[PDB]
Amino acid sequence: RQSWLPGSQIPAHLDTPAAQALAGNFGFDPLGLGKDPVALRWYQQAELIHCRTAMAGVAGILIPGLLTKAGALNVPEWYDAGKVAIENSFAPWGSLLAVQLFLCGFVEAKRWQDIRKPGSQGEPGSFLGFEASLKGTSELGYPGGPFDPLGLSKEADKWADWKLKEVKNGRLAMLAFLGFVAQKYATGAGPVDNLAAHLKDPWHVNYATNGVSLPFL
Template identity: 55%
Template sequence: MAVAVGRVFLIQPCSSSSSSFICKGTCKHSLGITTTLWSAKPGTTRRCMSTVVRAQQRPTWLPGLDPPPYLDGKLAGDFGFDPLGLGEDPDSLKWYVQAELVHARFAMAGIAGILFTDLLRVTGINKLPVWYEAGAVKFDFANTTTLFIIQLLLMGFAETKRYMDFIAPGSQAKDGSFFGLEAALEGLEPGYPGGPLLNPLGLAKDIKNAHEWKLKEIKNGRLAMVAMLGIFVQASVTHVGPIDNLVEHLSNPWHKTIIQTLANSASSS
């Protein structure tokens, strides 16, 4: 009978008959098995206990936690995190992977844009509005309604192409599907377009085996999504941009922290 202790160690009692010797000690076997022998009298049963150490197959978001069976580690950035079971359905899992990729890329672009424009504003290089007021700015070359319609059409076209490539991989790379510019995009697989326009440095040409590049992208994208959430909360509490918050914190790091900021905001409200 085997008794499981925790998840990693397995204790296996065993016995064998011995009538000619007394044994005591510990012996190690291959595959991480350690056998401990206890002394016994001649003519009695020798008892031993084997401890089998099972190496974890892959890292998970919580060490020692078994990932769900449908997350087998093949996806980029798969650490077995799905507490709501959203990926149980294979078709839904494929869509969630694409959705995460798009949100991660938007978050990385958004973080870069916010920090860059906020740095120009704080240093006085350019009189730009703080990022959460940029949408209310009226431009001279076009009115807000026109810009909104143009953005809607451009993003709608790009998202439609992306969706069509998702439901029929490779369909958007056929001749005539993109005004003769298919070779410039050279779709590699759903979610990973390429070509000189979207992959000018020629990275990860063999996208099927580009596991390291995929992992780096999704890790940075997840970090950017968390950072974007932090910037939203920061702007809601302090009503200034992230560079202003950073400068204020650096002016007095021990007394101007997130704890003091939240406490002052709660007391003032």
């Protein structure tokens, strides 16, 4: 039994067979948010969506940033890209965002209705023959089908390991984005600039010396 805090009392609601079947169960729920089984099911979906969005977002900031430093690409800072892109764009940001809400809203609604009634989006005749591919799998949050083109989930012996890797990297990506936001305000530089500055002089360039994080000191 792996725990986030060795020797602490694992919450009872995380030790049930249903809870222990979730990926990344390290017994961490000090606020008891997931005590209700229905709520835990909903929060598990929320964590997966945040994990996958954070991973795509952080990869869209870190990889272009590292290539920009190496000179392969020329991409602005993640916090300046929105302005640079819109100047050379074909639409104002208001019309761009509105289209996004319509398109995102449609797919999010279909995912929403599947959470309430799993497999219900396979209702015959609802979609133009494609509903058969929208039933998902037996596990909520792992649709598979057209969402798994390479069929990696079909390998049963590797299924548990794949899920743990996704949630572990997803949790790391979420903290990375929160680090980008905090470091932008604290230092006023880019994430790779912060990394280079720390490596140049680790003992004098960190959050204890940025003049913001520790005001009492």
